[PDB]
């Protein structure tokens, strides 16, 4: 049977014509998450409820509905149930959901549950905004210069999970086919050799870049940068870059700037010129440290987006406070972006900032911008007050050490 | 015919039993490089000659021999000669060589000439040391904490150059084979889809990691860190990690630290315990900013090494002064690690620091440690004197602006 309880009071969010219809009493599924999920999720629930309560004076209220994935799912549904079918059904049915960090088992041939959720629900946009909160300790001199939004492709690239183990019958079969049927001469050592496949498609690329450009338009951003390693991977990474520029030209009236290759796209709402440009991935990892102010919206493939989002989070001292969304055409899943940190689980110690800012993204996605703004306001005030969790406090002079739950309260206090 | 002139005075370096036999008058092939190669290469030649002259009081002298690759090769050997066979022969024959940056053409289906040199000569180690020079402007607060040596695998990974263009007959053929014969269900969009292949082998992994560990032993370093994304790419990146730890156990008496997974390897020369450990790639890009002091020698695959070496160079304000070597069992090629920057070519403007420090690596590789030490000493003094090229000067208060050639002289002045 199902162990999920549909809330008595509460109504389902619907989708008509690519627009969400959010009732005053939306049911929002949430996954508590394993490890420190037990610490950060309740802090998130309280902070969100408070922002919603304050923003709309009791007129609106989320009906939270617990659903399962990860270690907790095995405890609820039994031994080998890490990702129950009903969880996929419920996220699609209720349109908007949030999760803590997840335990994926090792030794049982199971692939990342985070990636499973993204792929099964076709949540092809991994959306990671990275900004600086004044007062956050940072290893760089000018973290305030970083204000970027990463659009990471979620459905393709080496993340597809297509690979075969060295010395397996399947690997030999693939290698045999490549060498004998495809005439491949470039495998340096064809014995005891693992093999992985990297796909990149026009449709996959264009739906991702389309979203990145519409976002820049909607939020009056200054540029979209395609980041790629196309000089070495001509037909995957290079094709991503070419398809990206082509989409700009074909759907958004992009026009050559000078002799190229950059394009200008006219914001139909503000008349601002949005620059469409590109940077090679290795150079980009240097540019985000050396010239962060020159970058805004980023569009890139799965693996590059993984690396870029994490490298940027570290700049802004945001390793434990980086928000994230996974968005598709039919539903969306917001998430803590850190791991399960089991050594601290239950100690009410870790930073709930990441999952709280993903909840800020969730509220904004719902059109509840007022409540979202209150969360941003609360976060800004609490950090500026130097009333923070251990991860910040240990890097600061004369700050005040707060528990996880207490930092949640400090956010509410600063709304 | 050949347009290379073998120097009248000078003798060939030989190799016996994995040990270089370097005469007092070694012939060293060099490739000038395109674009700013014309600026940085002569500065390198002068600085090296001066260090060698001073170190050994005229007893030793390099006989430089120009050889060709890139744009200059087409001017010397004709239209489509970007990489003449003789260049590969000469680098292998003379054992040690150095190059400026290279022009690879676009639009002619030619792959990276840098990668061509590495693969054709089986230079399977890309060696990139990253340290801080006092006085260098840096975007981070504590660049002095960064002192790492990157061992980047050079012969495998997606760099192999194995891929087919979307909509090509070959791509369809591969995709057909994967779906129908291999039962692949994970290609999200199989139409208009480019495909690349990622190989990783036991032999490829182990020769790279073996070198990294022998280096840590020889240079009394504190740890070797395997960096990988093995949680997503189990059979390539994950296999690299497993093979790395296994090599440590099997060849260097690595023993479990606590419950693992880290190992300790006893330095047979100093008795120091070298830690063998591992970090996931996205987290590692955060750790190099947040905990740089915890890292020393790094061993990783081709693409990850590309990104890591560049991200680290940016930390230490070393984007134009990062040295690099490509080392195999039979020869070695030292290189400027920046591009050709054609907008400045011939202006005697850019930083020759990168190619000069690669020449420092070359001299050290030759066993000429005294001359190498003089280059390090000169570089340290010149930068500390704030007498530097435009790339440093523009980031500094009250420094003195020097031309490329003049910075070369300043290095000599500080020896
Ligand atoms: N099979 C599983 S579950 C698996 C395995 C590997 C990777 N991953 C994935 O890779 C990512 C990293 O996970 P992981 O397991 O390797 O890292 P974790 O062990 O979960 O966390 C590593 C460290 O990050 C810091 N940290 C994490 N969350 C924090 C918070 N909210 N506040 C303050 N500090 C925090 C803590 O650092 P300090 O100890 O220094 O304070 C913690 O010890 C996650 O997305 C995870 O899903 C998953
Ligand atoms: N087909 C070819 S040749 C190709 C194409 C793409 C990439 N690549 C490879 O990718 C890497 C980057 O090359 P690229 O062509 O994209 O970059 P480049 O145009 O060669 O250089 C880009 C910028 O880097 C800075 N720079 C480079 N060398 C410097 C030095 N010695 N001193 C001071 N500043 C320096 C300059 O920045 P500022 O203008 O700000 O002062 C320069 O404008 C190279 O390894 C290259 O081989 C090659
Ligand atoms: Ca990540
Ligand atoms: Ca590079």
UniProtKB/Swiss-Prot annotation, chains A, B:
Activity control note: Inhibition of this enzyme by phosphorylation regulates the branch point between the Krebs cycle and the glyoxylate bypass, which is an alternate route that accumulates carbon for biosynthesis when acetate is the sole carbon source for growth.
GO cellular component, one term: cytoplasm
Co-factor(s): Mg(2+); Mn(2+)
Site note Critical for catalysis, residues: 159, 229
Residues annotated with N6-succinyllysine modification: 99, 241
Recorded effect of pH on activity: Optimum pH is 7-9. Exhibits maximum stability at pH 6.
Note on cofactor: Binds 1 Mg(2+) or Mn(2+) ion per subunit. Both Mn(2+) and Mg(2+) can be used, but Mn(2+) is 10-fold more effective than Mg(2+) in vitro at the same concentration.
Reactions this protein catalyses: D-threo-isocitrate + NADP(+) = 2-oxoglutarate + CO2 + NADPH
Effect of residue 241 to R: Impairs enzymatic activity
Binding site for Mg(2+): 306
Annotated binding of D-threo-isocitrate, by residue: 112, 114, 118, 128, 152
Similarity comment text for this entry: Belongs to the isocitrate and isopropylmalate dehydrogenases family.
NCBIfam families, per database record: PRK07006.1, prok_nadp_idh
PANTHER family documented for this protein: ISOCITRATE DEHYDROGENASE [NADP]
Name by which UniProt lists this protein: Isocitrate dehydrogenase [NADP]
Name of the encoding gene: icd
């Amino acid at each position: 049977e199902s162990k999920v309880v549909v809330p008595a009071q509460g109504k389902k969010i619907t989708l008509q014509n690519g627009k969400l219809n959010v009732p005053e009493n939306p049911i929002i599924p949430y996954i508590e998450g394993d490890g420190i999920g037990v610490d950060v999720t309740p802090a998130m629930l309280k902070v969100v409820d408070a922002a919603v309560e304050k923003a709309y004076k009791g007129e609106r209220k989320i009906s939270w509905m617990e659903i399962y994935t990860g270690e907790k799912s095995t405890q609820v549904y039994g031994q080998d149930v890490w990702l129950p079918a009903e969880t996929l059904d419920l996220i699609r049915e209720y349109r908007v959901a949030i999760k803590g960090p997840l335990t994926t088992p090792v030794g049982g041939g199971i692939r990342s549950l985070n990636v499973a959720l993204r792929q099964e629900l076709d949540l092809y946009i991994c959306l990671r905004p990275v900004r600086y909160y004044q007062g956050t300790p940072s290893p760089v001199k000018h973290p305030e210069l970083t204000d970027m939004v990463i659009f990471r492709e979620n459905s393709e690239d080496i993340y597809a999970g297509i690979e075969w183990k060295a010395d397996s019958a399947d690997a030999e079969k693939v290698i045999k086919f490549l060498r004998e049927e495809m005439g491949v001469k470039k495998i340096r050592f064809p014995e005891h050799c693992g093999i992985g496949i990297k796909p990149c498609s026009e449709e996959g690329t264009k739906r991702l870049v389309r979203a990145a450009i519409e976002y820049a338009i909607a939020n009056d951003r200054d540029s979209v940068t395609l980041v790629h390693k196309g000089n070495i991977m001509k037909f995957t990474e290079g094709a991503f870059k070419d398809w990206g520029y082509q989409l700009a030209r074909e759907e958004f009236g992009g026009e050559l700037i000078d002799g190229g290759p950059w394009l200008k796209v006219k914001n139909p709402n503000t008349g601002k010129e949005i620059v469409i440009k590109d940077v090679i991935a290795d150079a980009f990892l240097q540019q985000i440290l050396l010239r962060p102010a020159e970058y805004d919206v980023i569009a890139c493939m799965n693996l590059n987006g993984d690396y870029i989002s994490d490298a940027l989070a570290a700049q802004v001292g945001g390793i434990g406070i980086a928000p994230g969304a996974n968005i598709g055409d039919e539903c969306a899943l917001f998430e803590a972006t850190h791991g399960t940190a089991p050594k601290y689980a239950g100690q009410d110690k870790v930073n709930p900032g990441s999952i709280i800012l993903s909840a800020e993204m969730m509220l904004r996605h719902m059109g509840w911008t007022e409540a979202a703004d209150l969360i941003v306001k609360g976060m800004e005030g609490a950090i500026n007050a130097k009333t923070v969790t251990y991860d910040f406090e240990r890097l600061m002079d004369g700050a005040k050490l707060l528990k996880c739950s207490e930092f949640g309260d400090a956010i509410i206090e600063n709304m």
